[PDB]
Amino acid sequence: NITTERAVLTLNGLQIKLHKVVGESRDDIVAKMKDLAMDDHKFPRLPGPNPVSIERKDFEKLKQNKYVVSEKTDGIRFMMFFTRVFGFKVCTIIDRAMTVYLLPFKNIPRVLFQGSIFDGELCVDIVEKKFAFVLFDAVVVSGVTVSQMDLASRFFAMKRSLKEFKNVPEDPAILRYKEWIPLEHPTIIKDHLKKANAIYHTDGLIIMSVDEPVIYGRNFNLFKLKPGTHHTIDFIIMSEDGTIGIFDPNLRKNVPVGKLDGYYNKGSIVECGFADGTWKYIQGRSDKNQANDRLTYEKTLLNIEENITIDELLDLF
Template sequence: MPIPDIPGVKADRGLAEQFRAEVAHLLGRRNNNFPGAQPVSFARKHLRELMEHDYYLCEKTDGIRCLLYFTNDGPNEIHYLIDRKNDYYFVPNLHFPRHDDPSYQTFHTGTIVDGELVYDQEPGGLKLRFLVFDCLAIDGKSQTEKPLDKRLGYFRTLVMKPWEELFVRRHPEERQFLPFELVFKEMSFPYALSWMFDVKLPDLKHGNDGLIFTCKETPYIFGTDEKILKWKPAHENTIDFRLRLGDFPPLVANGNTGGGGGGGGPDFDAKPNFDLMVFHNKGDYRAFAPLHVTDDDWEVLKSVAQQLDGRIVECYKDAAGRWRFKRDDRGRPHFRDDKHEANHVSTVDKVLESIDDAVSKEDLTRSEQRIRDAFKRRQAERERRAKEEEAMRRMREEKRKRESVGGGGEAGGVAYNNGEPADKRLKPEPS
């Protein structure tokens, strides 16, 4: 499945800086860097983590990670996609109605959602969709301090449901004019692993390269989040390096090789050495390992007919322990032109730990019953505590009524948050 390009018009430097400052202020941050959370690679120790804390499970979509920023220009709503490079792309013809306006004319501003742009394969061709998996702010209020289930609950109630009511139920014919459709990414129980591998993944309409486990109990973290776990099959466990070309071999001075002989100069048809560089600090890249390039690989690299030196390329470690470039759907190197920098050395260390201490699909499915049992125990304990607290509340209320003079007033109602608990919206447990 092809990876989509980001639609829209890229904002110039000055305008982008203005938006970066707005977003930082909205989120209560002191810097203007890309605020998106980043996962860590799944290692064996994380099996215990899934047994001790509540997580959501979803498939890892192979698309373009973006934030979607809702703001306004005077009376008009405007929307920008924000990529990993922290560049802003104006996307016209989007409308996100508010939940409290029956006319569906008013719109959200000061809102940021996190998601993935992806092509879905439909009978009529490819359909561009934005899969939302988190929410950072709604209508000028940061949601990042709330746990994930509350963030998703607010998003579903305040943003997703009004959009679905307008564009899915009332005016579905209008969706064809949208640059992309909004979709809430399905979340499952963390122990629904066999169902995920056997039912969900084979039925996907888009590319997939693993699983994501996200803790439902914790706030949104800017940058690396140790509570977002990225599991990939061994062949998909990759690192993004900066590619550095070494010297080309010299021409052989016999008149019959490479660029036609003559000797002395470099033979640009011959295969050079390739170094994979790791990002340590700003401007500080250090050699990590050679890139293993076969003769066939070299022909593929030449066929790209683009600059290779300095590009960020996704690589995997083969069975012989050699680093190879990952190929895209066309068999070409998967260059990460959506990123300014290669993976930081700290990320590289975590991926290497994940590779050396790899957790297989079979390891996951063997653990699902223990994950389920632990999840159910925590759930039962929460329900027990909730019943005790409710009983205590009622006892206090009855005591207050008895002690009040003249009968007192009516008991106050239980306060509910906006948005149903996210657990109620999870996919049914697999049978």
């Protein structure tokens, strides 16, 4: 039976009240989304791509091939999944943790429930002070497995399925679509950004291929560019005195890599920022047990070094 507990999400000061599916219901809805998005990945994950941080080396590849660019909305990622379950026409949004919420809307055209997986962001519309779901991309429309098309194919695929659909005040989240600009349109992009920022919280640009089929996982060819004070690592407290370490797989240990200042609990996981030659404490992470691995530390440093800027991106092209 669809078994829901209540829940609330809170974003940028506002609260949404939704129905978390729990129990065998959560599992099926997830399982169904396995089978539709045809993901034979041993372990559970949204059928979605994960961005990676742009680094200098990338520009070459950006200069050659065809990419769109967009606002990195500051929101919660979620896979929107429309399905019928046991006779209930159901609209579910899925968190990265395979957490499932009913996000229902009046006007969802019956066909969507045939099997639609679109990929988008939950976030808060600064203007209405209302919630929105911005649609990035899409993987299956109404049974039509669109993963392998090109982006735009996918985007219109999405666009016209929801064409007749209209939003009603009562509805939980305004649907909207991500306006994806082509890289070679710098002036456009800037303005697009300065438009988007006025309505939503952003964290820089996302840079996606125009042409590759949907990627499930770490998508080394999905870029993020993120204003670089928001680069963090979770170290482990290796010493009362605040020596912090990181994990090194081939050596299999945690290795000291910095010293925080003062007095800290050994074996804590602490989220830290970098500035002025040094890492600084931000908050504890009781919720971890694992520092980041060496690579990540390396990469984030590399990244904090380069201080690649939005303009550096939107000037090359």
